[PDB]
Design a protein around this ligand. Structure first.
Ligand SMILES: [Mn+2]
Ligand SMILES: [Mn+2]
Lengths: 199, 199
């Protein structure tokens, strides 16, 4: 296909003061850009290996494909989950699903925050939808491992806990970054992803 | 180019009494046959996904590709590492490299045996060649993870320690299986693989 870096739906500084412009610029234009460039290179190498039936090469390329491929997937979703018009609480069917599956919105916040802060090293915190069980589910993924590709869950809301996502502003205080990000969550986008899972 | 199950270079009972015919027949005609068939099915699914640029599908298929792909690679080498003409000790440059890197042939035997018996669960014990360092190296791989694809080492001699490789004959006494396999090692094939790395 030849993947490309998607344009951001807002200005790099639109999420201030919760996430500063310098992080957004570096996070989008440098880290994400690298994943897309390396993903395209990795996909081209795998196509050659498949043509020659080189199983050894296919397996050797799996870490680069998952790492760069997942990085493209994860960050592409991440940008749509944020908005300068975000924050507050969700409404409608998504709010009802959260109460049913987690009890209340506040308890959901605590569990997703704990899952994200509890990540040892680099990874992601995710609110996902389990098609088999038909309910919401919280999961954490290491490094750039994508939720759906590795767990089967449909991603609804992702929290990047890579140090590059918060270290320029919040230093080592990961909880402060988690507390601040709730102010810019685009619940409209999360709702659209949730409704897409239902019939 | 479509992978196929290789024919065994000897009769199923040629390795008796060290490895009985029932294990060889089941190991080759049942287990290996499934890996090659499932490998081909997996490659077709990945080829379609790669054409559409579906990164999620590519990542979801990685476990099946590594498991079935590695199984095809590992067992295809395994059969060539055994021979009714095997046993004894290696000669020539291979014997010299073993003494240099391991001290003596007996010490190499002890180290590869320990690596194979020490595998927790299913996996493989391997004598490999390190292209970067230009010396021999022993490594263990879990499940069907192939040596070269995951470590870069060139496989010279592999020991299958999956329970299906010995449980019918040696029950839970894995050390007895390792003791018997040394009598049927095809050092001629190991030498040809080793010499192919040097130039
Ligand atoms: Mn990131
Ligand atoms: Mn086996």
């Amino acid at each position: 296909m030849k993947h490309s870096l998607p344009d951001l739906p807002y200005d790099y500084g639109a999420l201030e003061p919760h996430i500063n412009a310098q992080i957004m610029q570096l996070h989008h234009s440098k880290h994400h850009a690298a994943f897309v460039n390396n993903l395209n290179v990795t996909e081209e190498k795998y196509q050659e290996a498949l043509a020659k039936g080189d199983v050894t090469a296919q397996i050797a390329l799996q870490p680069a494909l998952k790492f760069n491929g997942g990085g493209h997937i994860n960050h592409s979703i991440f940008w749509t989950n944020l908005s300068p018009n975000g924050g507050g609480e969700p409404k409608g069917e998504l709010l009802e699903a959260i109460k049913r599956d987690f009890g209340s919105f506040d308890k959901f916040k605590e569990k997703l925050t704990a899952a994200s802060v509890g990540v040892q090293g680099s990874g992601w915190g995710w609110l996902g939808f389990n098609k088999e069980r038909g309910h919401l589910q919280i999961a954490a993924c290491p490094n750039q491992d994508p939720l759906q590709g590795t767990t089967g869950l449909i991603p609804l809301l992702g929290i990047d806990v890579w140090e590059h996502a918060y270290y320029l502003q919040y230093k080592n205080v990961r909880p402060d970054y988690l507390k601040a990000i709730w102010n810019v969550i685009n619940w409209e986008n999360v709702t659209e992803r949730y409704m897409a899972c239902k019939k």
